Scaffold this active site. Structure first.
Site, PDB file in Angstrom:
ATOM      1  N   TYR A 185       0.827  -1.187   0.000  1.00  0.00           N
ATOM      2  CA  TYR A 185       0.000   0.000   0.000  1.00  0.00           C
ATOM      3  C   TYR A 185       0.872   1.251   0.000  1.00  0.00           C
ATOM      4  O   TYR A 185       0.445   2.298  -0.464  1.00  0.00           O
ATOM      5  CB  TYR A 185      -0.923   0.001   1.216  1.00  0.00           C
ATOM      6  CG  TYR A 185      -1.898  -1.139   1.287  1.00  0.00           C
ATOM      7  CD1 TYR A 185      -2.203  -1.912   0.181  1.00  0.00           C
ATOM      8  CD2 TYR A 185      -2.530  -1.437   2.484  1.00  0.00           C
ATOM      9  CE1 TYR A 185      -3.092  -2.971   0.269  1.00  0.00           C
ATOM     10  CE2 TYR A 185      -3.422  -2.488   2.591  1.00  0.00           C
ATOM     11  CZ  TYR A 185      -3.702  -3.260   1.482  1.00  0.00           C
ATOM     12  OH  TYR A 185      -4.585  -4.288   1.623  1.00  0.00           O
ATOM     13  N   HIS A 244       1.498 -11.773   1.077  1.00  0.00           N
ATOM     14  CA  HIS A 244       0.398 -11.014   0.503  1.00  0.00           C
ATOM     15  C   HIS A 244      -0.165 -11.742  -0.719  1.00  0.00           C
ATOM     16  O   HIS A 244      -1.338 -11.630  -1.014  1.00  0.00           O
ATOM     17  CB  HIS A 244       0.841  -9.574   0.207  1.00  0.00           C
ATOM     18  CG  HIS A 244      -0.281  -8.632   0.038  1.00  0.00           C
ATOM     19  ND1 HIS A 244      -0.106  -7.267   0.006  1.00  0.00           N
ATOM     20  CD2 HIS A 244      -1.622  -8.836  -0.063  1.00  0.00           C
ATOM     21  CE1 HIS A 244      -1.294  -6.679  -0.121  1.00  0.00           C
ATOM     22  NE2 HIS A 244      -2.221  -7.620  -0.149  1.00  0.00           N
TER      23      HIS A 244
END
Length: 308
Positions: A62, A120
């Site tokens: 992010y 992830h």
């Protein structure tokens, strides 16, 4: 009163994540470069005001650690009332390996550990000089050393989990997937497999169906029934859906810019769905075609199995 999931290792995790750092407001061409004050603000306001233990969803990918750092430093929320999920960026290499990525995250976040660390994606960047086995072993060490209080994966197929279970000293505790009424199996058979192996699912973008409701909205049974339940319980449609995720034994992960919706998200355990309301949401959702917002290039081929 707050509800928690008990991971396979005995640890407690808040049963909804109401605060995400994936979504930014930055007024610039290159948004990747620009600090988002409006994000640190919504996060800090969440931490300050949202009652109980506040579960934040972060990820290396992010690129919002500074924003989350700023809010963590400035918050009067004590550290033990925050549950911080963070994610090693395996799809797009930012750091060499999980240990380096977590080290860098703790530095920028101003914290000593994260409450959950996920790999992830299973699609390891070709530029990483580590594979999944090695990646997992690192997370196993981060766990052992207490820098990651819990460890798991995200967007893993049944196969990806088997590779990990095959070499796992520490069984992955969480698999974070896209899950909603309109994508009830991110990859074939993942939900049933994960829950049978006591791997807690989180559902990312559970509110997909409410992203932009169709034009013929309250003609569609899914949307009629959802509206029906929102009035019965006097709750928002979102709250019903988030609660349904929970009722499915899955930990919904949601975010908003609006503190109201965040507080509403935290407060889904002010009410409860009956067995048949849950089954019906499930059922009416399953009639809808798959709606997949994430890992689209990789998993589109699995759409035929997502809404079984």
């Amino acid at each position: 009163n707050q509800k928690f999931f008990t991971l396979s290792n005995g640890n407690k995790i808040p049963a909804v994540a109401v605060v995400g750092t994936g979504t930014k407001w930055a007024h610039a061409e290159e948004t990747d470069a620009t600090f988002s004050q409006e994000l640190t603000d919504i996060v800090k306001l969440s931490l300050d005001t949202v009652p109980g233990i506040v579960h934040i969803d972060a990820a290396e990918m992010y690129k919002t650690y500074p924003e989350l750092g700023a809010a963590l430093k400035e918050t009067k929320k004590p550290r033990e009332e925050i549950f911080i999920t963070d994610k090693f960026s395996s799809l797009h290499k930012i750091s060499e390996d999980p240990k380096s990525a977590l080290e860098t995250a703790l530095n920028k976040l101003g914290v000593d550990y994260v409450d959950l660390y996920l790999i992830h994606s299973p699609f390891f960047d070709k530029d990483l000089n580590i594979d999944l086995e090695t990646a997992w072993k690192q997370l196993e060490e981060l766990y052992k050393s207490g820098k990651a209080k819990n460890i798991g994966v995200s967007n893993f197929t049944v196969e990806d989990l088997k590779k990990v279970l095959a070499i796992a000293e520490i069984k992955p505790q969480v698999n974070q997937i896209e899950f909603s009424p309109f994508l009830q199996n991110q990859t074939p058979g993942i939900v049933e497999f994960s829950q049978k192996n006591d791997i807690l699912l989180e559902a990312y973008s559970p509110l997909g169906p409410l992203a932009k409701k169709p034009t013929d909205a309250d003609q569609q049974p899914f949307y009629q029934y959802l509206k029906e339940l929102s009035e019965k319980y006097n709750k928002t449609e979102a709250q019903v859906l988030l609660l349904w995720v929970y009722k499915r034994g899955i930990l919904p992960v949601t975010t908003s810019a609006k503190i109201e919706r965040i507080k509403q998200a935290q407060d889904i355990f002010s009410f409860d769905l009956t067995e048949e309301e849950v089954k019906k949401i499930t059922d009416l959702g399953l009639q809808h075609e798959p709606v997949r917002l994430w890992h689209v290039d990789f998993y589109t081929k699995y759409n035929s199995e997502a809404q079984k």
